[PDB]
């Protein structure tokens with residue numbers, strides 16, 4: 001089977017930018033991008049933007065978004081496992097975010113932020129729990145690449161990307177998710193219902209400096225982490 | 230193997246009355262109660278109550294949240310029943326109080342048409358339903374459907390006979406809109422579904438208009454009949 005690697009990080013940290021660098025560095029190295037486009041134009045597998053609806057009235061749409069987001073990821077991630085990489089010697093599938101960061105970082109943060117009531121949040125937890133243990137050892141990650149950046153850098157990279165929905169985001173929101181990231185992957189004190197995660201290796205890279213051209217060091221680091229996997 | 234039959238019908242038609250009768254008749258006969266119907270009385274049941282109270286309170290906000298949890302519940306209950314006591318029983322039949330297809334094609338459909346679910350809610354629901362079902366519940370495919378036919382008028386009476394105070398509000402107009410949905414689907418079979426096999430699933434239509442609580446003999450004799458013909 002394929003080594004499943006997850007690239008984690010805050011909003012605008014540099015996930016797609018870095019994951020594209022690695023994507024290009026090898027055949028049998030493939031990527032599973034977060035389906036942000038499906039959330040942008042809700043068309044069935046013209047249509048509304050559920051990423052916008054959530055940022056505009058989070059108290060109204062957080063649960064509906066958080067649900068479609070996770071489901072769209074699950075779908076995509078599975079769909080890739082079946083991809084050409086199946087018939088390819090020594091393969092590596094690089095996932096842009098994971099089912100673990102949807103719940104324990106974003107959805108968790110919204111419930112805490114009072115944008116999901118106890119009921120909304122319980123339903124989501126039971127759904128995520130039940131739904132995830134229906135694959136077994138299928139979507140289990142082999143390793144995690146944490147792309148570390150200040151919530152300050154993120155706010156600036158949000159303002160470079162220039163996606164309308166998120167131009168309203170305050171430092172405080174990024175600051176909240178940052179802390180959640182640090183507790184999950186750096187200090188590793190964020191307990192999850194996924195007991196295997198406890199023994200999963202994490203490579204933490206400080207992607208604060210504009211690595212777009214100065215990325216050789218970052219790539220040397222991934223290649224070493226992957227050998228040890 | 231276990232034969233899957235679903236009991237379909239409008240509100241207060243007599244589904245829960247019939248699934249109880251059938252349950253008592255055979256050791257080989259097991260029944261799967263509607264999650265909604267239960268909640269119309271342990272976190273899976275605690276959430277149920279909460280969401281159903283909000284559902285009545287403001288259907289414009291909780292239609293998606295409800296039709297979602299109520300359907301995941303159904304899949305979870307039915308997948309659990311398949312691995313139950315019937316597994317090693319000589320000639321087993323599993324009766325389902327309403328199906329995963331009625332949730333979507335009658336109720337969830339009606340709520341999108343009521344404007345209680347917007348287009349974006351509706352797109353996501355249809356997509357969530359298409360996926361959940363094609364992955365997890367591919368076994369929960371039906372062997373047959375027993376339609377419990379009753380005039381919207383009959384149901385309106387049996388809603389009072391029931392007495393659930395929230396239910397006492399339900400207009401005849403609402404029951405008439407749901408009636409025509411059932412009739413188009415199961416009786417005329419003009420209702421188009423995303424599930425291709427439902428074009429050739431056998432349907433026994435029973436006229437539950439007369440009180441069957443005490444004269445259920447013939448009704449069961451026609452079921453016994455239908456079961457052999459699968």
Ligand SMILES: Cc1ccc(NC(=O)c2ccc(CN3CCN(C)CC3)cc2)cc1Nc1nccc(-c2cccnc2)n1
Nearest residue numbers: 240241265266269281284285288289336337343344345396
């Ligand atoms: C369980 C429930 C409670 C209330 C409602 N609907 C309403 O209560 C309601 C109220 C007003 C309108 C019309 N009006 C349109 C315009 N907008 C702005 C307001 C509403 C429509 C529906 C649906 C449901 N949904 C539902 N879904 C599945 C099953 C059942 C159900 C209920 C009882 C017994 N058996 C099954 N019920």
Ligand SMILES: O=c1ccn([C@@H]2O[C@H](COP(=O)(O)OP(=O)(O)O)[C@@H](O)[C@H]2O)c(=O)[nH]1
Nearest residue numbers: 012013014015016017157160161210211212
């Ligand atoms: O070294 C870097 C990495 C990222 N970015 C910019 O930061 C924004 C967000 O990047 P990305 O989509 O990769 O972030 P993600 O949210 O996927 O982590 C984009 O405008 C990038 O060009 C940048 O200027 N320099």
Ligand SMILES: O=c1ccn([C@@H]2O[C@H](COP(=O)(O)OP(=O)(O)O)[C@@H](O)[C@H]2O)c(=O)[nH]1
Nearest residue numbers: 241242243244245246387390391440441442
């Ligand atoms: O032959 C019958 C069947 C049902 N009922 C009454 O109909 C009401 C609702 O029945 P049920 O719960 O079976 O309906 P469902 O909503 O499940 O279709 C209850 O008060 C029953 O006692 C009745 O009077 N006679």
Ligand SMILES: Nc1ccn([C@H]2C[C@H](O)[C@@H](COP(=O)(O)O)O2)c(=O)n1
Nearest residue numbers: 010011012015036069102106107166
């Ligand atoms: N469960 C999730 C997943 C993603 N997002 C948002 C954050 C971004 O605005 C976008 C995904 O792109 P990014 O790579 O910038 O995080 O969706 C969210 O709020 N909740």
Ligand SMILES: [Mg+2]
Nearest residue numbers: 015016034036
């Ligand atoms: Mg992105």
